[model samples]
Target chain A: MLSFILTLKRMLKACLRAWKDKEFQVLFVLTFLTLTSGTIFYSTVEGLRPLDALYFSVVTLTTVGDGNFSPQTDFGKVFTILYIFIGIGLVFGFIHKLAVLPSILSNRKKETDAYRLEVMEKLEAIEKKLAEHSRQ
Target chain B: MLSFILTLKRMLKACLRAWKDKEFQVLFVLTFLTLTSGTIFYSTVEGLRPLDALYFSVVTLTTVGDGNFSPQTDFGKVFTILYIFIGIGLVFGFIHKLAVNVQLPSILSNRKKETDAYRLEVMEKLEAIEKKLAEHSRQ
Candidate 1:
C-alpha cells in the first residue's frame, strides 16, 4: 500500500510535469476543443443529454464503435467522417508519447542502462541455475 | 484473416522500433502538437458543432472514433471527461503509439504465426508419410 501510494505520488508529479510542457499544453488545448465541440454537436443533433452525446463520441473516437448509436442526418454524416480522420490521428500520436515515456523521463540514462544490464545478468544466472536443476 | 494478422505484426514491430529510438522526428512533432493543442483548447470552448467536434476530435485522436451519426449526449459527457484525462495520461507516451496500431497488428501477427506453424507441421507429416510409402513400395 505504501509503495502504491508512492507510485501514485510519482505519477501525479509526472502528470503535472507533462501538463507544463509546451507541447503537452498545445495537445491539451486541442483535445479540449475537440471534446467540447463533439459533445455539443452530438447532443444537439441526437436531442440526447449532454453526457450521453459525449459518451457516444468517446466510444466512437476510441474505436470501440459500440454500435449503440449512429448519425441520422446528412450534415451529421459529413461531420462524422471528418471527425474520424482527425480524432484517430490525434489519438495515435498521444499513444505513441506514452510508450516511450519511461526512457524519455528517466533521470540517469547511463545509470538506467547499467541497472538494466545488472538485472539482465542476474536473470541469465537464474535461468542457468534453473536449467541445471531441470537437467538433474 | 491470416494476412491481416501478418500486416498488424509488421506494423507493431515498426512502431516498437520507432519507440526505442529517442530521436525526434516530424511525425512525432506533428502528432503531439496537434493532439495536445486540439484537446486543450477544443474542450474549453463551448457552443461549437458539438457532434462534429466530438466526431472530429475522437476520430483524429483515436482514428477509430467512427463517423457514425449517433446523438447520444450523455455518452459524450462521460467520454469527454474520461477521454480528456485518459487521453492525456494513458496515451501521452509510447503506449499510445502501441495502442493506436495494436488492433491491426494483433490481428495480423497471430494469424501469420499460426499459418507458419501449421505449414511446417504439415510439411513434416508429409515427409514422414512419403518415407514410409517408399519403404513399403520397396518391400
Candidate 2:
C-alpha cells in the first residue's frame, strides 16, 4: 500500500513536470488567449453568440468552413478577410512552434549522442592518465 | 476509363483517410461542437435568431468582431464571460492538437531518414567488405 502510494505520487510529479514545462505552458496560454480573443471579437463584431463565434473562428482558421454560417454585413466581410489572414498566420505560427521546431531539435539532439559518447571516452582516457601520474 | 476510375478512387480514398484520421476528426468535431454549442447558448440567452447566434459565436471565437450584432442583456454579458473562457480553451486545444503535437510526431518520424542515410553508408561499407571477401576467396 505504501509503495503504491509512493508510485502514484511519483507519477503525479512526472505528469506535473511535463505539464509545467515551458513549451507546454506557453502552448496552453497561447491556446487560451487565441480562443478567448477570437471568441470575443467574433461575438462582438459578427453579431454571433460566443459559441458560434468560437466555432467560426476555429473553422475559418483551420480553413474548414462548412458553409453553415457566413458574414453578411460589410463589417463582417471586411473583418472576415482580415481575420483570415491574421488568424491563419497566428494559428500556423503556434503549430509550427509546438510541433515542427521541437521535432527538429529533438532529432538534431539525438544525433549528438554519438559525439557525446566520443567525448566521454576521450575524457575517461585523460582521467586514467592523470591517475597514473598521481600514483608515480 | 480504368485510369479515370482509378484516379477518382484515389481521391475518394484520400478524403476518406483524411476524415477518418483521429486528429482531423477531433479538430473538425471540436470546431463543430464549440460553434454549435456557442450558437445554441447565445441564441437561447440572447434571444437572437439561430443564424445570428451562429454568426455571433463564430465571430466572437474568431476574434473578428466587426460590431454588426451584440448582446444587450445581463444574461448575455454573463454568458459571454463564461462562454469566452470555454471557447478560448477549446480553440487553443483544438489548434494545438493540429498545429503542434500531431505535426511534431510526424516530423520526428521523418527525421529518422537521417538515420536511414547513415545506415545506407554502413551498408556500402559492408558491401565493400563483401567484395574484398569474394576476391580473397578467389585467390
Candidate 3:
C-alpha cells in the first residue's frame, strides 16, 4: 500500500514533466481528440450511453480487443477498423511517454547529483591547494 | 491512406526493435503472465468462456474498463481491484516501450544514414587528393 502511494507520486511527477514537453503536449492533444471523436461516434451510431461509448473507445484504442459491446452496424465496424489503426498508435504513444516520464526525470536527477558531487570534490581540492599556498 | 500505411510500417519496425530489447522482453513476459493468470481466474470464477475471459483480462489491464462484461462475483470484483492496481502498470509499461520503439529505430536509422553520408564525402575527398598526387607524379 505504501509502495503504491510512492508509485502514484512518481507517476504524478512524471506527468508534470511530460506536460512541459512540446511533443508530449501534441501527443496528449491527439489522444484526447481521438478519444472524444470515438466516444461521440460510438454513442451516436450505436445508441449506447455516453459512459459506455467512452469505455468502448478506450478499450478499442488500447488494443485490448474486448469482444463485449462491439459495433453491430456495418458503418460502425468500418469506422472502428480505421479507428483502431489510427487511435491505437496515438494512444499508445501518449501512454508510453507518460510511463517513461518518471524514469527520465529520475535519470536527469541522477546526472545532476553526480555533477554536484564532482563540483564539490573540485572545490575541496582547490581549497586545499589555497591553504597550502597560504602556509607557504 | 498512404500515411496510415507508413505509420503501420513504422510501428511494425518498432515492434521488431522492441523484441530485441532485454527490458522490453521482461515487460512482455510479465504482461503475458498477467493476462494468462487473469484469464484463468475470470474463467474459473465468473464461468466465462475462455475467450471471453481473455478479452476481459485485456480490457481491464488496459484500463479501458468496458463495463459490458464485468465480473459479477464478489471474489472476482475484489480480485479485479487488486489486479487493476498491479496489472495496469505493467501493461502500460509494456505498451509504452512498444510505442516508442518506432521512434528509437527511426532515430538510429537517421544517425546511420548521416554517418554513411559523412564517410562517403570523406572518401571522395581522399580520392580527389589521390588523383592530384597521381597527376603530379605523372608530371
Candidate 4:
C-alpha cells in the first residue's frame, strides 16, 4: 500500500516534469479532448447518463468491454466503432509521449552540448590560425 | 482492417525494438511473471478453470475488465486489488518502452539535421572571425 502511494507520487513527478515540454502539453490536451468528446457523444447519442457515459467512454477507450450497456442503434454502433479506434489511438499517443519523456529530455541535452562543443572547437581553431599568422 | 493491420505491424516493430533494450527486457520478464502467477492464483483461489483464470488475468491487467467472471470472495478481492495495480504497472512499464522505440527514430533523425545547421552556423561564424583576424594581422 505504501509502495503504491510512492509509485503514484513518482508518476506525478514524472508527469509534471514532462508537462514542461510543448509537445507533451499538446498530448495532455489531446487525451483530455478525446475523453471529453467521447463522453459527450455517448451521452447524446445513446441517451446514457453523464456518469454512465463517461464511464463507458473510459471503458471503451481502454478496451475493457465488460459494462452492461452498449449501443443498440445502428448509427450508435457505427459511431462507436469509429470512436473506439480514434479514442484508443489518442490514448496510446499520450501514453507514448509520457513514456518516452526521459529519452527526449536526454536527446535535447545532448544536442545542446554538441552545439556548445562545436562553438568551442571553432574558437580554438580560429585562435590557433591567428597565432600562426601573427608570427609570420 | 488495412489501417488496423498497419498499426499492429508498426506496434510490433516498436515492441521488437524495445525488446533489445536491456532494462525493457527485464521488466518484460517481470510482466510475464506477474501475469502468469496471477493466472495461477486466480485459478486456484477462485476455483476457476485455467482458461477462465487467464482470461480474467489478462482482462484485469489490461484494465479491460470484460467478461462475466469477477472475484467473488473477500480474499479474492484483496488479491485482485493488489494484482490490478502491480499488473497494470508492469504493462505500462513495458509498453512505455515500446513507445520509446516507435517515437525516437524519426524524432532523432530531425535532431541530426539540427546538428548540421548548427555546424554550418559555426562555420559561418569562423569565417567572420578569420576575416577579422586577417585584417588585424595586416595592421
Candidate 5:
C-alpha cells in the first residue's frame, strides 16, 4: 500500500513534467477534447449517465472492449467507430508520453551534465591562463 | 474511412518498430505474460468463458473499466487489484513507445544525415590536400 502510494506520487510528478513539453501538451489537449466530446455525445445520443458515458469513452478508446456496455443505436455506433479511430491514437500518445517520463528526465539530465562539463573545462582554462599571468 | 485505414497502417508500423526496442520488448513480454495469466486465472476462478476472461483482462489493464464484467469472488477481486496495478504501467509503456515511433525515426535520420555530412567534409579535405601535393610535385 505504501509502495503503491509512492508509485502514484512519482507518476504524478512525471505527468506534471511531461505536461511542459509541447508535443505532450498538444496530445493532452486533443485527448481532453475527444473525451469531452465523446462523453457529451454518448450521453445525449444514448441517454447514458454522464459518468457512464465518460467511462464508456475511456474504455472504448483504450480498446478494452469489456463487452459490458455497447452502443445500440446506429448513430451511436457510427460515432463510436469514428471515436475509436481518432481517440485511440491520442489516448495512446498521451499515455506513451507519461510512461516514458523517466527517459525524458534522464535525457534532460544528460544535457545538463554536458553543459556542466563544458563550463568546468572553460573555468579550468581560465584558471590556467590566470596562473600563467601571475607567474609572469 | 480512408483516414482510419491510414491511421491503422501507421499504428501497425509503429508497433513493429517499437517491438525492436529492448525496453519496449521487456514491457511487451511482461504485458503478454500478465494478460495470459490473468485470462487463465479469470477463466478458472470465475467460470467465465475463455474469450470473456481474456476480454476482461485486457479491459481492466487498459483502464477501460467497462464495468460489464467483474470478478465476483474475493480471490478474483484481490487478484484483479494487483493485476491492474502492475499491468497498467506495462501496457502504457508499450503503447507509449509505439506512439513515439515517428520521433524515433526522425532522430535516427538526423544522426544519419550528420554522419553523411561529416564523411563528405573529410572527403573534400582529402581531395584538397591531394591537389596541393600534386601541385608541389609538378612545380
Candidate 6:
C-alpha cells in the first residue's frame, strides 16, 4: 500500500490536474526544450550517435556521471558544463512540480472538516456551560 | 548574479527540516539499506571488491551505466536487472521525499495557518459569548 508506485500514480493524477495550469505548461515545455537542445548539441559537438547523445544528455542532467559518453573536446567540455547549469534547475523543477502537486491533490479538506467539527463541539460545550450559569 | 542561489539555499534548510521528520527518517533508512544490500549482493555475486561493488551499486542505482563494470554471469545479470527495478523506486522515492519536503513545506504551512486561524476565530467567538453570559449573570 505504501509504495513508490502509488506515489507515482498519485503524481500522475497531479499531472493531469496541473496540465491545465500555466506554470506547469511553461516548465514542461522549457525542460523539454533544454534536454532536446542538449541532445542536439552533444550529438553535433562530440559526434555521438542520437541515442548516445540523448543518454549523455540525461545522464549529465541527472548528475549521474559514468566516464563513458562524455565530451572529449575543450569546446564540448565547456559547453557541457554550461548545459548542466541550465538544465539542472529546469529538470529538477519539472520533476519537483510534478511530484509535489497541489493542496487539492493532498485532499486536506478532510483534515479541515475534522478540526471544524472539533471546534464546533468545543464551542457548544462553552455555550452549554454559559447557559447553565445564566439560568442560575 | 546568483538569481536562483537563494532558492537553492532554502532547499538545504528544508533538507535539514526533513531530517527531523518521521516519514523522511523511514525513507532515508530504507534508502541506505537498499544501497547497503546492493553493495553486498554485487560484492558476492560479481566478485568485485567491496568498494568497487559499492561503486557499481551506486552507478547502477543512479541509472548511469558504466561500460567499465558489468555482470559476468547470467545470474548476476538477472539480479542486476531486478536490483535496478527495486532500487530505482527507492532512490526515486527518496529523491521525491527530499523534493517534497523542501518544496511542499511553506505551501503546507499555509494550510497549517489556515487551520490555526479558523480555531482562533472560533475561540474568539466563544469568548464573546462567554463575556455576554458573564455580564448577564452579574446583572
Better of 2 and 6 by lDDT: 6
Chain B alone, TM-score, model 3: 0.57
When sorted by lDDT, best at the front, the candidate numbers are 4, 3, 6, 5, 2, 1
* Positional deviation of residue A58's Cα in model 3 after best superposition, in angstroms: 6.6
lDDT per residue for candidate 5 within B98-139, as digits (tens), equals 555356556755775785576556556555655564465445
- Provide the lDDT at A27 for model 2: 60
Candidate 1 residue-wise lDDT, B26-139, digit = tens? 235445555655545444453335445545455545635444443334444554455445454434543533444435556655765775576556556555555664465445
lDDT of candidate 2 over A10-101, digit per residue (tens)? 64474476587787677667656776677887799878877777666665655545245688778788877887787666656655644435
Candidate 6 has a TM-score of 0.44
lDDT of 3 by residue, A79-121 (tens): 7756765764575566655443446746865886587566556
The list of candidate 3 runs beyond 4 A from truth reads A1-89, A95-136, B1-12, B95-139
What TM-score, computed on C-alpha atoms, does each candidate reach?
Answer: 0.41, 0.42, 0.42, 0.45, 0.42, 0.44
Give the DockQ (C-alpha) for candidate 6: 0.12
- The predicted structure with the larger DockQ, 3 or 5, is 5
Single-chain TM-score of chain A, each candidate: 0.62, 0.49, 0.58, 0.61, 0.57, 0.59
Stretches off by above 4 angstroms in model 5 are A1-16, A91-136, B1-59, B62-89, B95-139
Residue A53 of model 3 has an lDDT of: 90
Interface RMSD score of each model = 20.4, 13.4, 16.6, 7.3, 12.2, 8.3
lDDT of each residue in A1-136, candidate 6, tens digit only: 3654555466557547768888878876876687679779888878976656655665566565545446788999998889888866775665665465455556667766877787788678777877787677
Best by TM-score: 4
lDDT of 4 at B4: 83
Instruction: Give me the candidate number with maximum lDDT.
Output: 4
lDDT by residue (tens digit), candidate 5, A36-60: 8988998998998776666667656
Clashing pairs in 3: A96-B96
Rank order (by DockQ, best first): 4, 5, 6, 1, 2, 3
Local accuracy of candidate 4 as per-residue lDDT tens digits, B1-139: 8698689888899668766656555565667787889889988988788888888888877787865665656577667656765764566655664545455567777877787787788778777887888788777
TM-score of chain B of each: 0.31, 0.54, 0.57, 0.59, 0.57, 0.62
